[PDB]
Write a protein that binds this ligand. Sequence first.
Ligand SMILES: O=C(O)Cc1csc(Nc2cccc(CNC(=O)c3cc(Br)ccc3O)c2)n1
Ligand SMILES: [Zn+2]
Length: 351
Amino acid sequence: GASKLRAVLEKLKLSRDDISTAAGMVKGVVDHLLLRLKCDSAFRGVGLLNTGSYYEHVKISAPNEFDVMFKLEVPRIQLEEYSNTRAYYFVKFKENPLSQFLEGEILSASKMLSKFRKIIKEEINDIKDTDVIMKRKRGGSPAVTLLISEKISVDITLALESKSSWPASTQEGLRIQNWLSAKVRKQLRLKPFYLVPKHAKQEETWRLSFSHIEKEILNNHGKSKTCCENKEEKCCRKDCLKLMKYLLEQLKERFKDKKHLDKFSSYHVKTAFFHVCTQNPQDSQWDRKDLGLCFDNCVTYFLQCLRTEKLENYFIPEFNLFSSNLIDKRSKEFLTKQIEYERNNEFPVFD
Ligand SMILES: O=C(O)Cc1csc(Nc2cccc(CNC(=O)c3cc(Br)ccc3O)c2)n1
Ligand SMILES: [Zn+2]
């Protein structure tokens, strides 16, 4: 079966590294937006989360779809935990550039997104080169989506940066100690945390964002410092993640007409994969000759999470991604049925 898996990985590589003028058209549009935003006293300290890398995708089956984050440093920050949710907070301070966005003691996520969208939609009209259009949708983050030329899309998210100790909810999270080490857990937690506008079921809440840590773990994934740097040390961690992302993206497209899978995203997949990496910390548990075995095990864990209705957040342990108060049993049982059929028929959806 692994020869079908490696064929799927071979086809996914042929669309990645290919010659595309889109990755430069995206960078040119981003730089335009970022320069205009810096003119405003509120958005003066704005810039990309990972500079040099605009080319970031949530979707592995949609190369034309890009996803960027615009970070802004919020000093003198003070958080207040919304309704014992563990993940959702209000933003309070300690005259400030964003004083124009305050409502009582709480920072308006709506009025901040408002000025943010306003500026962008004006910067698009000042581009008579390419036909950029601003799509407006509800959900907090992604804040805005741009369509360059045709069928080339960029999702821009606004994130507040706090160069201070991560919230008390994260104390027992990121259990990488027996895999990536205690030294690494200490280092990563010394990095800043990001907050994106996100509505909790109105309330002007901000949610914790760990996108920078995710990329950090994925680009240095072995117990060995030289994992995947030589022939003797070749693992299948990344290919296992790639395939799980591709399976959920394919099933989501298959049943776009129904509404059962709308609630599932690559984040449920990545959270589940990191729990597997923790459970199997050795590089010898991910040898490249075991791709079929390793992936089936990844599929099995994700399935156990759907059936038991338990998927702990990788960063905030008391937060369950699969609780009944977020995703209904019927939707999880539909996703279980589809994955079980695919696995039993050696993944036809991959084709
Ligand atoms: O924006 C949406 O609707 C889709 C979406 C994105 S994160 C989410 N749920 C979500 C709910 C509660 C607490 C968090 C905290 N963060 C993460 O655990 C996280 C994990 C990885 Br791996 C990568 C980046 C992350 O920040 C997240 N839902
Ligand atoms: Zn490796």
